Design an enzyme around this catalytic site. Structure first.
Site, PDB file in Angstrom:
ATOM      1  N   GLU A  35       6.483   2.628  16.964  1.00 15.28           N
ATOM      2  CA  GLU A  35       5.470   2.196  17.808  1.00 15.28           C
ATOM      3  C   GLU A  35       5.293   3.297  18.938  1.00 15.28           C
ATOM      4  O   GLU A  35       4.064   3.933  19.470  1.00 15.28           O
ATOM      5  CB  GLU A  35       5.391   0.777  18.505  1.00 15.28           C
ATOM      6  CG  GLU A  35       4.853  -0.111  17.378  1.00 15.28           C
ATOM      7  CD  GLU A  35       3.600  -0.332  17.030  1.00 15.28           C
ATOM      8  OE1 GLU A  35       2.955   0.696  17.472  1.00 15.28           O
ATOM      9  OE2 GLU A  35       3.230  -1.116  16.109  1.00 15.28           O
ATOM     10  N   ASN A  46      -7.146   2.630  21.294  1.00 15.90           N
ATOM     11  CA  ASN A  46      -7.369   2.097  19.883  1.00 15.90           C
ATOM     12  C   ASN A  46      -8.862   2.459  19.624  1.00 15.90           C
ATOM     13  O   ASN A  46      -9.686   2.608  20.771  1.00 15.90           O
ATOM     14  CB  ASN A  46      -7.145   0.598  19.872  1.00 15.90           C
ATOM     15  CG  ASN A  46      -5.767   0.221  19.909  1.00 15.90           C
ATOM     16  OD1 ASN A  46      -5.686  -0.600  20.907  1.00 15.90           O
ATOM     17  ND2 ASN A  46      -4.845   1.031  19.424  1.00 15.90           N
ATOM     18  N   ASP A  48     -11.764   0.639  18.898  1.00 12.23           N
ATOM     19  CA  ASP A  48     -12.336  -0.404  19.636  1.00 12.23           C
ATOM     20  C   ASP A  48     -12.320  -0.260  21.317  1.00 12.23           C
ATOM     21  O   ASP A  48     -13.098  -1.294  21.720  1.00 12.23           O
ATOM     22  CB  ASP A  48     -11.965  -2.068  19.426  1.00 12.23           C
ATOM     23  CG  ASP A  48     -10.590  -2.376  20.022  1.00 12.23           C
ATOM     24  OD1 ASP A  48      -9.988  -1.781  20.701  1.00 12.23           O
ATOM     25  OD2 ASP A  48     -10.184  -3.653  19.832  1.00 12.23           O
ATOM     26  N   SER A  50      -9.841  -0.522  23.441  1.00 15.70           N
ATOM     27  CA  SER A  50      -8.689  -1.132  23.899  1.00 15.70           C
ATOM     28  C   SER A  50      -7.522   0.023  23.978  1.00 15.70           C
ATOM     29  O   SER A  50      -7.710   0.961  23.351  1.00 15.70           O
ATOM     30  CB  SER A  50      -8.076  -2.524  23.311  1.00 15.70           C
ATOM     31  OG  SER A  50      -7.666  -1.860  21.953  1.00 15.70           O
ATOM     32  N   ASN A  59      -1.248  -4.383  23.411  1.00 17.83           N
ATOM     33  CA  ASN A  59      -2.783  -4.287  23.100  1.00 17.83           C
ATOM     34  C   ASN A  59      -3.565  -4.998  24.160  1.00 17.83           C
ATOM     35  O   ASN A  59      -3.452  -6.290  24.302  1.00 17.83           O
ATOM     36  CB  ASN A  59      -3.219  -4.654  21.799  1.00 17.83           C
ATOM     37  CG  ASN A  59      -4.694  -4.000  21.445  1.00 17.83           C
ATOM     38  OD1 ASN A  59      -5.334  -3.795  22.428  1.00 17.83           O
ATOM     39  ND2 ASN A  59      -4.990  -4.111  20.099  1.00 17.83           N
ATOM     40  N   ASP A 101       2.338 -16.104  17.563  1.00 17.36           N
ATOM     41  CA  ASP A 101       0.953 -16.568  17.708  1.00 17.36           C
ATOM     42  C   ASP A 101       0.358 -16.904  16.282  1.00 17.36           C
ATOM     43  O   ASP A 101      -0.791 -16.777  16.251  1.00 17.36           O
ATOM     44  CB  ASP A 101       0.010 -15.333  18.335  1.00 17.36           C
ATOM     45  CG  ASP A 101      -0.448 -14.313  17.505  1.00 17.36           C
ATOM     46  OD1 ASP A 101       0.220 -14.288  16.291  1.00 17.36           O
ATOM     47  OD2 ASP A 101      -0.929 -13.319  17.896  1.00 17.36           O
TER      48      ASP A 101
END
Ligand code: NA
Length: 129
Positions: A35, A46, A48, A50, A59, A101
Site C-alpha cells: 500500500e 483514486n 473517483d 477520493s 480511503n 465491516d
C-alpha cells in the site's frame, strides 16, 4: 516516517493487529508494504476523486475527512491528515473498523492481489516480536 519492516511489525503488534479478526501480523505488514512501502506520509488520489492516506492507504470515500471528497463518509471520525503521522495509532484504530465491516482485509486491494494466499509469515521473519 518510513518504517523498517520489523519496526512496523512491532508497532502493529503493540497496537493489537496480530490476529485481529484472524489476520496474522504478516498480513498487515504485507498490506502496508504494497500500500505505502511503509511510508506514513504516502497519499494517492483514486479515480473517483477520493484519496488514500498513510501506511494502510485509508480511503476518504468512507473513513476520513480530507475536505475535498464530496458525498463521502468519515466513519473513523478523523481528519485524513491524522493518518500521515509518524504515530500509527490513528491508522491502526481506523483499520480495525475497516476490517470489521464485512469484507475483512479484501477492503485493501493490494492485500487481495499481493498478500492473500501467499506465505505472509515471510514478512515478519527475523523480527524480534
Ligand atoms: Na470522507
Amino acid at each position: 516516517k518510513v518504517f523498517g519492516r520489523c519496526e512496523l511489525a512491532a508497532a502493529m503488534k503493540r497496537h493489537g493487529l496480530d490476529n485481529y479478526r484472524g489476520y496474522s501480523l504478516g498480513n498487515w505488514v504485507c498490506a502496508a508494504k504494497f500500500e505505502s512501502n511503509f511510508n506514513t506520509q504516502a497519499t494517492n488520489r483514486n479515480t473517483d476523486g477520493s484519496t488514500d492516506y498513510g501506511i494502510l492507504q485509508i480511503n476518504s470515500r468512507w473513513w476520513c475527512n480530507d475536505g475535498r471528497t464530496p458525498g463521502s463518509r468519515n466513519l473513523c471520525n478523523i481528519p485524513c491528515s491524522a493518518l500521515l503521522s509518524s504515530d500509527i495509532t490513528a491508522s491502526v484504530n481506523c483499520a480495525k473498523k475497516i476490517v470489521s465491516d464485512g469484507n475483512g482485509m479484501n477492503a485493501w486491494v493490494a492485500w487481495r492481489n499481493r498478500c492473500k494466499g501467499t506465505d505472509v509469515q515471510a514478512w515478519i521473519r527475523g523480527c524480534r516480536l
